[PDB]
């Protein structure tokens, strides 16, 4: 539920910000974002990106926080 909220909100934020390529869709973008949460991602490709400096920062915010607090927080719960 929590990851879904964080992921969903972040995906919505991305969808508005730059359609770019493969981020045009919410179903695809969410898949793109989930891949990031799992910890497999390709980072700062940028190319064809608007507010990329703005955007790279957004990716740093979302990816870092998600790996850092949700996954560890769930994982901490798991032991």
């Amino acid at each position: 539920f929590v990851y879904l909220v964080f992921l969903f909100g972040f995906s919505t934020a991305v969808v508005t910000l730059i359609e770019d390529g493969k981020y045009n869709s919410l179903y695809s973008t969410c898949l793109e974002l989930f891949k990031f949460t799992i910890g497999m991602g390709d980072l700062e490709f940028t190319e064809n990106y608007d507010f990329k400096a703005v955007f790279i920062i957004l990716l740093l915010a979302y990816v870092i926080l998600t790996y850092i607090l949700l996954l560890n927080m769930l994982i901490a719960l798991m032991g």
Partner: protein, 31 residues
């Protein structure tokens, strides 16, 4: 439009052709 040389792409760039946005300054640099 295209943010020619010294053009800042925080948003709306769309950096011109010979230019490329480098994700620190957000200005457009080429060459």
């Amino acid at each position: 439009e295209c943010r020619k040389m010294f053009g800042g792409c925080s948003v709306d760039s769309d950096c011109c052709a010979h230019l490329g946005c480098k994700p620190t300054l957000k200005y457009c640099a080429w060459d």
